[PDB]
């Protein structure tokens, strides 16, 4: 369960996150494969040129120039992708779970389920003890939940954190992508034990990392666009008070009150999945149905 | 139960997509498990030639000519086929998982599945059956009232099919365009003279002859896929889908008072009647108030 | 499940297909695992010859001759087997997953399964629910017979698929027997790479020659058996009017001499289900007599 | 499953032997392509070493040539024959479950026996309803009309063991005949002189002394299998299978009115009594008219 | 189910056999990885010595001396251990399978269990449902007393299997003591390959010569312990007269001097079972006297 | 099931045994993976020395010195660790699976579990026919068990035997492990007589995985040391409380029923073991041991 509070901008984000994870794991796999750098000593019929270097001196040169000339971005790109995917997924999961605010969600889901299976909605639009108990417990839930600010402000905090993390990711990926290069000009001072001073190196997974970087940049661009749209949606209509106006006109009940804060936010969240549970809640919220039920009882 | 709303074209295209995925992954896995390019210098009884090159200079030349001589298509073909296969998969399944387009579909399928085991159909042409049938009538009436004005369950289908058609066209375009560039032996002209001593090289691409065959197979499969998509698009345009005609049904049933439904209900009725051209008649039975009149007359 | 509507051949050939697939993949296990063609230059007590070649020139020569000398059949043998096995598996399954050709299958299977367990079957030859149960199954039989007794849509596809399978069997035998003799162990390689290696003519050995030849012979045997089974089926479909069925012997045995003789698609499916168990036909024909309707209405009232 | 009751001791013994043969064959195949098969050196028809002056690929060429030009076909393709024959034994031992003729009758028989296996009427009548007992009876009477008409479910079990026995005989024949050709040191005389420089070679087959012991173990296993097959063939012949005699039941029961059946049902009774000797006694009680008449009289 | 019938030595020998299997498989899995032989030619400031041999002549020498210089015991140590361990496993739990050997044990276990908790035993030692239960107990007691008296089918097999285990012990310890000194580190390989390598005498080192040695000792030790247990079993099967049972102490303790002596298979089974628990014997003996039947008949009325 | 009958000192050792097993397998795998001894010849601007040895000469030298230069501890430490851990596990899991002394265990567990939660227990300690009948049956089961168990001494000798065996094993382990721990060193000197085969007589060798073993060795000792202490404590517990006899003193005073007897022998030892887990199961059992309870149930039957 728990999928009812999932607007269209919450499964798309999960798909984007899993795609980013796939990109990162592919990058790490390619990192572990291949021989990485390859360096040769620069000198500054067509017979070959004899460098006269042992088999271990090549390994020494390659290892020294792999951590002396390559830019720090070209060596730790998949790791950064993995870290950012991890933090995005954790931020997505942290809001809902919050070990200490989940019960308010499970009990609310149970309330929605019970109000969904009630067949009295049809009669109201135009076993009594069970309904009375349901009304009493719904009143208890209202009085218990309608007070605090714990389901709106922290959602905004999550979204703002996501947007700022995005802005930073775009910021430093845009600049540090022209430094992923194929051929580099390693220049070290190992002259008394190798014999050569200037070496030219050829990083292998350069173009592939450039393509992966472009793909990752586009995927984030879409993710940040989604999060920015959500934040703007939360900050141009002020979804803190819910006005039950159309329900009153299209239902006939004239005693429909308006709820405020967290319950209003949860109603706002629900309507994206199906704009019909508010119908059941409005029908169940009237005090005249219980009056008629007890009048019939007597 | 979603397979009912899946005509033959949308199982044939699904099998085509699966085959595309398998060929693409085969190519991708074969690419790595191979020695790739191999280059040698050019000298522009028999006795061998002494090049006097080290063991690392060979690797240097190989991995330099790999990215300085080979065409971009010959290197990233499995990746392209994987990407396009993934788009094709998440281009036809998107019309189901979009929020706001799922509740109507599940309600429709529930009503259709339920409106099959009703004795009234047999009797048309005991307390439980009457109340259950009345509940079915009320549910159908309210659902019809629901899906009558907001007609977003059909434009998405045409849009996605058009997207598939245009993607197919471009796929064919630049696969036929750049399929003759996958050659076996190539010439590499890189300027590394003070490092290795040779300026001109001749290279062989190990997987050049296999990639051509896989490209041809992919071209054939995508051509068949595009032909199916064009047929579906044509079927979606040769007569209005936002209306239905219970012409012969009313004539052969003698209940000629049922109105002709339109918009989303009509379109899904067109889609479903292809799978089984009988269910529509069942719906007719549970769209006439005359059945309710018979029920009330029998009760009263 | 969907196993009753399958004669012996349709459960025999199936095994062959999977067997074929195994051979296919088996080849693919080695075609990329074992070391491929090995080539040496040719110069046309005992002391060896110094060719004076590096270790990369050897790889160059090997993978150039591998594609400039070997026949196109010796390299792609497993892939053709895999493709043909897959397409046979597809053709044999173009029977249950084609909208417009599966509704009748499921209807008939469900009706047969529910009718075989009906008590009226054993009561005919010597309650409350059974009344309307038998009634409803009777209208279901009536509507089914009025439904699937006009067009042979589902009998015109079995013939099509079997004919295509026979044609493909012929093609496979033809071209596979044509080129089975070109898989050779030792070959000659005449490529003009002298400015880069110094040697013009090479002699090569293809590592997987005998193994491919033996696998090819096994594949030919399997395909021949497959084609013989398909030929038997084709002969089975044309030696009488398969589109008509007569309820004569059942009437003689039982005594209810009023069940009509069906034709077309339902007759075809009844023949198929008869090729598996000669008991279903009678158990269903007993629900086709007007006298049975009279007995049912007398019992109910 | 529900078909596990048709397994005498020898059938399960043969299954265990066959899985053991498969294990040996897969072990042999695993060792086949994991080592270097052959090692060949040229022959030259103070102590110092002698230099061949051969490259590192001419050794591979020589090894690969002499491996398929000097080794007997038995030493190379040994494990595959073991796998083929184990697979064929597995197939032959089960070619009477999948045939439609035998598949239907076995299922019907097991269903009838299972239905009779949970009938409290038998326990009540022996130790100390209606339609279920009555209906089960009518099935039995017609059951011994469909089954006792020909040799279908019994002819297979006698026509397959003969094939198994003959296949065992031929296996022993050409496996003992060609076990002395697995040599360790062999000679190779190939005419490759203008390419390598040496004409005569001496070769060692690394996996020679192990294939001999594997062959001996395989011969022992197949010999035990063949002894089992001969035992079951003799058991199928020393006394008639087409007839079953209800002899001891008459003395141990006293209800001397049960007739004796023949043919496929007789063979099935033979096998089931070879199984746990408790199904026959339970099933025989549904053949006496006395119990049915008593039940009818009591009910009416 | 049948574990209650297993005395201590059965589980002890089972654990020992499992340990033998463990060490054998450990030896085999160490051999598969690192087992090899290193051979060098012999020449019967400081500088190194040049042998002037390629990388293939070393492999030739190694794999020739590996089978012309190593004793067959060192080559295959763990395979024999595995074979013998499997033989011991099959020898154990052998008499449980060849005969029926399922009813004769399970029924006895069930009767002993339901005789253990019979309230009549407690009533005597200090409705109709109890009467019929006791009658059933007595009648099946007599039924098995008469039925099983046919020979020795659950007794001779035990002696046969113990004897076979003892003989396996004797032979195994014999030839493992005989050959344990044939495993060495350094060996001399005198093979005649002179025109192909140039060297006639070689000295070779075996990798796991000091390992297979130590393991062997451990293995031997385990076997030794095994044998002792088996010997004890033979002492138990040879000293006590298991073919007859004598109900002596019950007569003096209870005073009801009418219980007859049981013999043969039931005597042996009681001798075996009383080891697990010396209380089931008296519970079984209670239901063997005619006075108990007389009391049962009197109470039934 | 087998949880209540396990004091804390029998679960601390359970954790320690698995810790030792994992350390041993870690050592074994790190041994099988990495390279063994590496040896070089000795010569008993700078320029390198050319030994002039082939690639198989070096393998021969390494393989011979690995066995002619290394002390047997540095060679086979981890298998000793594994053997001793397995022996400890066998010792600790002995009396649960020894025929002739295991049936009593589940009999006692079942009886105690049955009488732990019964309405009659609550009713009797406060001051239907089915409940009375089941209580009566449980009374007979307890009465027969008392005579079934309260006569032998087999479940007490085995416990002390296994504990003393574990203690002596711990002593031996610490003894020789401490003795042979300074012989696991890094650089060793190899002196083999091969002059006609390789050309060099004296070699110097380095054992690759030496220091690591030493580290592991110390860890092992610590665990064993702790293990020993635990065993010692248990060995002290058995020999100072007089575990043979059990007194129902506290139960009588806090319940008032002055007819519960003092049990001895095997049953007393089992009660001593169980009350070390939670000291109220004894009360629930003692409820089902009073003739007063039998008389009360007999009266309530009427």
Numbering used by the authors:
A (entry chain A): 16 to 59, 95 to 176, 234 to 405
B (entry chain B): 16 to 59, 95 to 175, 231 to 405
C (entry chain C), E (entry chain E): 16 to 59, 95 to 176, 231 to 405
D (entry chain D): 15 to 59, 95 to 177, 234 to 405
F (entry chain F): 16 to 59, 95 to 177, 231 to 405
Paper excerpt:
Volume-regulated anion channels (VRACs) are expressed widely in vertebrate cell types where they mediate the efflux of Cl- and organic solutes required for cell volume regulation. 8C-8A(IL125) consists of a 25-amino acid sequence unique to the first intracellular loop, IL1, of LRRC8A inserted into the corresponding region of LRRC8C. Like native VRAC/LRRC8 channels, 8C-8A(IL125) chimeras are activated strongly by cell swelling and low intracellular ionic strength.
The 8C-8A(IL125) maps showed no apparent symmetric arrangement. Therefore, the final reconstructions were done without enforcing any symmetry and resulted in five structures with resolutions in the range of 3.4–4.0 Å. The most apparent difference between the structures is in the arrangement of the LRRDs. The arrangements of the LRRDs in the other three 3D classes exhibit diverse arrangements and subunit interactions. As a result, several different subunit interfaces exist between the neighboring LRRDs. The distinct arrangement of the loops formed by D50 and K51 is also observed in other classes. For example, the class 2 structure has only one subunit with K51 pointing toward the pore, compared to two subunits in the class 1 structure. The groove created by the distinct K51 arrangement is located between the subunits that form one of the two loose interfaces in the class 2 structure, despite the presence of two loose interfaces.
